[PDB]
């Protein structure tokens, strides 16, 4: 029930790396995973990987394990059930094939068989 604003649409050239942010609000940042999804011009959508703001644990697709740099800060608690966190995103070997819109995504539940499912999405960040 909160927003997940990201960075702007920074366009670079292949070989370099791009930093993408994801500032949360309106929900406990440490209670839900942060997924990262992109939709490039050449494929459809592809699941990159999520990370736990509580356990600090990572799990990402083998197609992005040796490229993605994925970190999170620590939430600045506003109330008992509200906080403000941040999720970061970086790639390694960049090409024009990775040109697409990128967004972060808050996990679905806190327990069960769909704990990390991307429920609350960001806004989108246009890459190269």
């Amino acid at each position: 029930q909160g927003q997940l604003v990201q960075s702007g649409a920074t366009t670079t050239k292949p070989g370099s790396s791009v930093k993408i942010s994801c500032k949360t609000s309106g929900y406990r940042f440490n209670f839900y995973h942060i997924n990262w999804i992109r939709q490039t011009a050449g494929r459809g959508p592809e699941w990159m990987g999520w990370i736990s703001p509580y356990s600090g644990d990572k799990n990402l697709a083998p197609a992005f394990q040796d490229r993605v740099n994925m970190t999170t800060d620590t939430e600045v608690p506003v109330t008992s059930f509200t906080s403000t966190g941040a999720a970061y995103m970086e790639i390694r070997n960049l090409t024009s094939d990775d040109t697409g819109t990128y967004f972060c995504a808050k996990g679905l539940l806190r327990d069960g068989s769909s704990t990390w499912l991307p429920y609350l999405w960001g806004q989108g960040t246009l890459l190269t």
């Binding site: 008992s80 059930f81 539940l109 806190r110 327990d111 069960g112």
Partner: protein
Amino acid sequence: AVFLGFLGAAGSTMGAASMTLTVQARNLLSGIVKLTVWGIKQLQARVLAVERYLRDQQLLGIWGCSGKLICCTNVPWNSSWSNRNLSEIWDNMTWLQWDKEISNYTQIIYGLLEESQNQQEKNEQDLLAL
């Protein structure tokens, strides 16, 4: 299981905190161990302890839940109280978040549970009248 302790799951899901009820059921009354400052003030606190406890046992008794830690009843869940799904409750928000959303309707529910019990032992009263 993990012995989280007293109120250990206050920030955990309602499905995880519901499986550790006898932990907070013990320390709600603690126990046993004459005119001064703390002396009169201790006895005033010892009386208040059993009063708030007997109110929760009296309320549980008139609902047919006397002796239950998890108690199922007849009153159906009104959508006006909380039109939320079953999965977005027991595997999401905590018992602290739940009490704030139900703080309004919590008095209406307490009356629905009372007559739902009186119109159950009265039905069973006729069920054993033959």
